[PDB]
Amino acid sequence: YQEDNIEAVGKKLHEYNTQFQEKSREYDRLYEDYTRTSQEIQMKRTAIEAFNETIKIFEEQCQTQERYSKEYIEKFKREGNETEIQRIMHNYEKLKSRISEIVDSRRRLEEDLKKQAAEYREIDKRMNSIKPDLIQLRKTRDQYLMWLTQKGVRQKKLNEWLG
Amino acid sequence: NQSVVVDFLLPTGVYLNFPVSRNANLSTIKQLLWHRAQYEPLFHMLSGPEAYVFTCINQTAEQQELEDEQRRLCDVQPFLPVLRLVAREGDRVKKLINSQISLLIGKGLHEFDSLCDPEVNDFRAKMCQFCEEAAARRQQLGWEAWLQYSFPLQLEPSNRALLVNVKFEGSEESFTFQVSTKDVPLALMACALRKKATVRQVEQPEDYTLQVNGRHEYLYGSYPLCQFQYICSCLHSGLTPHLTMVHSSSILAMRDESSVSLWSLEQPFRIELIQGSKVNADERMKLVVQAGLFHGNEMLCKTVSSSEVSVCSEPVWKQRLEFDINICDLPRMARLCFALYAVIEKAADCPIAWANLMLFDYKDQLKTGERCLYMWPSVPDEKGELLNPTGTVRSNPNTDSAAALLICLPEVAPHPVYYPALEKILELGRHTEEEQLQLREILEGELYEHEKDLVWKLRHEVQEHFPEALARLLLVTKWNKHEDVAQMLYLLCSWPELPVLSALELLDFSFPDCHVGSFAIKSLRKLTDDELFQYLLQLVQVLKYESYLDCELTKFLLDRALANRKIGHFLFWHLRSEMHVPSVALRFGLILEAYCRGSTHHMKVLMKQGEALSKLKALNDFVKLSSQKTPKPQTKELMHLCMRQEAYLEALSHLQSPLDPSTLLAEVCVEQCTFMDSKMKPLWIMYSNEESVGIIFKNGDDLRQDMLTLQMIQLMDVLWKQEGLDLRMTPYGCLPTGDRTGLIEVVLRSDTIANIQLNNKDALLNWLKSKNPGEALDRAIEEFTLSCAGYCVATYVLGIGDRHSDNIMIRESGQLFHIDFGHFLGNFERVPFILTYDFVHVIQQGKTNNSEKFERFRGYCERAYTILRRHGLLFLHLFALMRAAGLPELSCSKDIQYLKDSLALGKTEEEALKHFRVKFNEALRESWKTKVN
Ligand SMILES: Cc1ncc(-c2ccn3ncc(-c4ccc5c(c4)[C@](C)(Cc4ccccc4)C(=O)N5)c3n2)cn1
């Protein structure tokens, strides 16, 4: 139209509160990893931008080297100073191989960001699997507490069970 | 090791690679480069070293032209050690400031461009323009006006003799002479000037200003001398004021160091839920999307739900979700809110993530077309609501990895449709004693449904007779009806100006409408700089409830930051300390950029602070790492060796304190520096300048809670002092500066109760006697009594438990104060009022029964409590706004309810005071019983 003894319900209130506190501490730990990883992924993403901008500067240097050197390569060829041409070109070769080192460093970081992106997703997945238990344990704890309050159980007795 | 291999790109295209010291400055590196470059091809075509500037990529991924060549390479912190020589010429002022802003705000300005967001671009263009104009206008002002901007008066909340030591600038010769306590500063200046004349003899008194020795604090204006905090502090302590006469020129030297209405569209509002992306859910479960339309915290109509599709990474829906409201009835701040749920198949639902969307844009256009809403993950909290309407309308900036919902807003008309302009709103908006008696009692507790319909009918009566009840009338207004919205806004436009107290309530998330916030700010423009500063923390937090970037509150805060440098200082740090929080990084970064452009002088001060703070972080990280390995004396010595490195010592020395920019942190007393034994190993950093000051750097805890508590205690102190009650409080500085990072002011000449008691004993009372021998003991006891009452009432009202010998301190003056406010509002049940037996004993002068003294102490407690009750609504409104902060212990109406009960606001004053008396007496009874155990 509109189910147990008090000591038995209180024991179960104590158990469910203890299970809720543990599940909360598990969630809080995961949320901390979630927070830490989100910050770290952001830092790596700005680091990749920094690599990009570094590589860009080096490619401007290559452009500059090629336009600027031409006249002096031609001038030293007329004057027979082919050793000075060889110095300019060997110096430019050193520039090029330094660009390959930096590109390789950018690649290592892109692969690290890839791994940590998957970690972020796995952390979020674990959080989302914990939430049902966490929420269900909170609601169950509150129902036992209300049942006992209805039954007229004093606050001091409720406090012993709640931790 | 010391050296580092640096790549050098010459403008001829030539490339050099060689080691330089990490400590070497760029000017020295440029010399080493020039000496090596002469043995490389194409040297002869280079101009001289001074024709070029180094460029690098810095930590924020931006190119930076390194104009200051006295900077060490380790300070410049280039992403990779790559320095490129480029031509100096161009707009080097704008280049330099742009680069400094990026480093200072902790976010590269390029990240704002990369968004390709017109709202962002319009904000920066408009706000940076306004801030620069104020800065230029400020520069054209006289030396007095600039002094008022940069060093505003530090006055007590507010006749005997007083001798002051006056000195002149660039002269060790000083003058001691008598001055009346009620003299104006100008009279003191005219006196010292005559004694300077009486030696060549002439200058005028108006051309001078007075400075507190070793501080950027200045005594000027029409106020009497005792009203200045420095003088008031000097008068009470008994020390003689030490002032310096400074000339006008010396202050100028510092300065120059179309045819379719919205109301015609009667079709229902609807959306197309297309697809979700990068979902991380339980594969056995199914996915659901709850959608709902909101205005503030009120639902405009029923929540419509999607169909159930299987859990995968990339779920597809393609459903026309239709809502029970017409397009014509959507209010200006109508808010589409989503929540993604993983649900068990029908044969505890998981809230996965949520996202909100303004239906109208920043230019008032009703949005059409596709949107990609990058979601925020749902946190399971106590009040598990279906949706999160209070949450931010900004997108999750982790677009790489965060879950997304793709939606489509359909085309409502052939041409774009705007929310009607104010003129059309006011055009549509125009047009008994029993029900007048019913209104009276209703307004003298949120209203029930039957009461709402009466207040709405008598809304014209509410404007005329109960103007203070605007907040109540706005909540009863039906924001899902444009006729009612039009009528409410018609009244709002003619509504009389409300007091500051009422305006603070209207800044809360319940009142999202732009006209309401605008009316609120209008009422807050009355605020003095001193009062504003008391509410600054709260006004910053309510920016998190704003929908658009360009808003009245942002404009107001920048206005005040540009007119007062102290306000700008603390506005900067309140915004800066939250730049790590992705929901506010964009909004706060944009305000910081605009602020910086209007504040080039303070930029330089803030830069020095940021670098100090960055060194302290690394110094503290070393100490955490060392403390777990070795014993403390060795770690302390290793701390000092790390500190005495040139780059560390220079970065840590000669800065204005973040806690108080008028205080100069001059020379680091490295031997006096140490760290504390708590979990995070907070650093204790001592400085010396000209009459010792200390700061605690703490990294690992969020100090915002502590700052809030200390600000409330400071507000209490002001409110008490305003009624002539000085309870001798020590509301010491606490400032969050970064991610779980902040500074705490050291109170010197103080110890913990535990240390004093450690050495039924008279240990506390003997310590006072040893520090205040003979005639000074009575003063000291009175200082203890006054401060004990203030902190007894403060801790009770705020619900601060865990108060013990380790976190209560005493100054040698006698003043008692509390430290470490990690818990409040009854967190660790109601925290009872608490009297300590050992403190009663000091209040009774070491006697068993001293009723005269004890009754005076009781009186102070009772008067303190009574004054706070009179300003109870101020505390409630301020705390209500602080719910935006997201502090775990200030999240809900229960937390606010704690303050209502402790201040007994539901009771009459007589009733409140009688209950407080019973609580007091019961605390005295308890005081006896606690120490016997
Ligand atoms: C969260 C939070 N909030 C506020 C404060 C806080 C704020 C201001 N002040 N002003 C003095 C102290 C202070 C605290 C503890 C102790 C001391 C002083 C001495 C007497 C001196 C000492 C200092 C360092 C290492 C060793 C000894 C001691 O022995 N213990 C202090 N604390 C701290 N933490």
Swiss-Prot record, chain A:
Q: Subunit details for this protein? A: Heterodimer of a regulatory subunit PIK3R1 and a p110 catalytic subunit (PIK3CA, PIK3CB or PIK3CD). Interacts (via SH2 domains) with CCDC88A/GIV (tyrosine-phosphorylated form); the interaction enables recruitment of PIK3R1 to the EGFR receptor, enhancing PI3K activity and cell migration. Interacts (via SH2 domain) with CSF1R (tyrosine phosphorylated). Interacts with PIK3R2; the interaction is dissociated in an insulin-dependent manner. (Microbial infection) Interacts with HIV-1 Nef to activate the Nef associated p21-activated kinase (PAK). This interaction depends on the C-terminus of both proteins and leads to increased production of HIV.
Q: Which family does it belong to?
A: Belongs to the PI3K p85 subunit family.
Q: Name one GO biological process term.
A: positive regulation of protein import into nucleus
Processing after translation? Polyubiquitinated in T-cells by CBLB; which does not promote proteasomal degradation but impairs association with CD28 and CD3Z upon T-cell activation.
- Tissue specificity comment: Isoform 2 is expressed in skeletal muscle and brain, and at lower levels in kidney and cardiac muscle. Isoform 2 and isoform 4 are present in skeletal muscle (at protein level).
Q: Which GO terms describe its molecular function?
A: 1-phosphatidylinositol-3-kinase regulator activity; enzyme-substrate adaptor activity; ErbB-3 class receptor binding; insulin binding; insulin receptor binding; insulin receptor substrate binding; insulin-like growth factor receptor binding; kinase activator activity
Query: What cellular-component terms does GO give this entry?
Result: cell-cell junction; cis-Golgi network; cytoplasm; cytosol; membrane; nucleus; perinuclear endoplasmic reticulum membrane; perinuclear region of cytoplasm
Query: Which organism encodes this protein?
Result: Homo sapiens (Human)
| Top-level division of the source organism's lineage | Eukaryota
Question: What disease involvement is noted?
Answer: Agammaglobulinemia 7, autosomal recessive: A primary immunodeficiency characterized by profoundly low or absent serum antibodies and low or absent circulating B-cells due to an early block of B-cell development. Affected individuals develop severe infections in the first years of life. SHORT syndrome: A rare, multisystem disease characterized by short stature, anomalies of the anterior chamber of the eye, characteristic facial features such as triangular facies, lack of facial fat, and hypoplastic nasal alae with overhanging columella, partial lipodystrophy, hernias, hyperextensibility, and delayed dentition. The clinical phenotype can include insulin resistance, nephrocalcinosis, and hearing deficits. Developmental milestones and cognition are normal.
Q: Which UniProt keywords apply?
A: Acetylation, Disease variant, Dwarfism, GTPase activation, Host-virus interaction, Phosphoprotein, Protein transport, Repeat, SH2 domain, SH3 domain, Stress response, Transport, Ubl conjugation
Note whether Phosphoprotein occurs among the keywords: yes
Which residues does this entry mark as bearing Phosphotyrosine?
Answer: 31, 144
Swiss-Prot record, chain B:
Which Pfam families does the record cross-reference, listed alphabetically?
PI3_PI4_kinase, PI3K_C2, PI3K_p85B, PI3K_rbd, PI3Ka
Is ATP-binding given among the entry's keywords? yes
List residues of the PI3K-RBD domain: 159-247
Q: Gene3D superfamilies per the record?
A: 3.10.20.770, C2 domain, Phosphatidylinositol 3-/4-kinase, catalytic domain, Phosphatidylinositol 3-kinase Catalytic Subunit, Chain A, domain 4, Phosphatidylinositol 3-kinase, accessory domain (PIK)
Q: Where is this region: Catalytic loop?
A: 799-807
Q: Does the keyword Amino-acid biosynthesis apply?
A: no
**Which pathway does the database say it acts in?**
Phospholipid metabolism; phosphatidylinositol phosphate biosynthesis
Question: Where would one find coiled-coil regions in this protein?
Answer: none
Where are the stretches annotated Activation loop?
818-836
The PIK helical domain extends over: 431-598
- Keywords from the named record: Adaptive immunity, ATP-binding, Chemotaxis, Cytoplasm, Differentiation, Disease variant, Immunity, Inflammatory response, Innate immunity, Kinase, Lipid metabolism, Nucleotide-binding, Phosphoprotein, Transferase
Source domain of life: Eukaryota
> Where would you say this protein principally sits, based on its record?
cytoplasm
Query: What region holds the PI3K-ABD domain?
Result: 1-89
Q: Which GO terms describe its biological process?
A: adaptive immune response; B cell activation; B cell chemotaxis; B cell differentiation; B cell receptor signaling pathway; cell migration; immune response; inflammatory response
Question: So what does this thing catalyse?
Answer: a 1,2-diacyl-sn-glycero-3-phospho-(1D-myo-inositol-4,5-bisphosphate) + ATP = a 1,2-diacyl-sn-glycero-3-phospho-(1D-myo-inositol-3,4,5-trisphosphate) + ADP + H(+); a 1,2-diacyl-sn-glycero-3-phospho-(1D-myo-inositol) + ATP = a 1,2-diacyl-sn-glycero-3-phospho-(1D-myo-inositol-3-phosphate) + ADP + H(+); 1-octadecanoyl-2-(5Z,8Z,11Z,14Z)-eicosatetraenoyl-sn-glycero-3-phospho-1D-myo-inositol 4,5-bisphosphate + ATP = 1-octadecanoyl-2-(5Z,8Z,11Z,14Z-eicosatetraenoyl)-sn-glycero-3-phospho-(1D-myo-inositol 3,4,5-triphosphate) + ADP + H(+)
Please summarize the record's notes on activators and inhibitors of this protein.
Answer: Activated by growth factors and cytokine receptors through a tyrosine-kinase-dependent mechanism. Activated by RAS. IC87114 inhibits lipid kinase activity and is selective in cells at doses up to 5-10 uM. IC87114 blocks T-cell receptor signaling in naive and memory T-cells and reduces cytokine production by memory T-cells.
Q: In which tissues is it expressed?
A: In humans, the highest levels of expression are seen in peripheral blood mononuclear cells, spleen, and thymus, and low levels of expression in testes, uterus, colon, and small intestine but not in other tissues examined including prostate, heart, brain, and liver. Isoform 2 is expressed in normal thymus, lung and spleen tissues, and is detected at low levels in normal lysates from colon and ovarian biopsies, at elevated levels in lysates from colorectal tumors and is abundantly expressed in some ovarian tumors (at protein level). Both isoform 1 and isoform 2 are widely expressed.
Q: Family per UniProt?
A: Belongs to the PI3/PI4-kinase family.
Assembly description: Heterodimer of a catalytic subunit PIK3CD and a p85 regulatory subunit (PIK3R1, PIK3R2 or PIK3R3). Interacts with ERAS. Interacts with HRAS.
Q: What is this protein called?
A: Phosphatidylinositol 4,5-bisphosphate 3-kinase catalytic subunit delta isoform
What organism is recorded for this protein? Homo sapiens
Question: Its gene?
Answer: PIK3CD
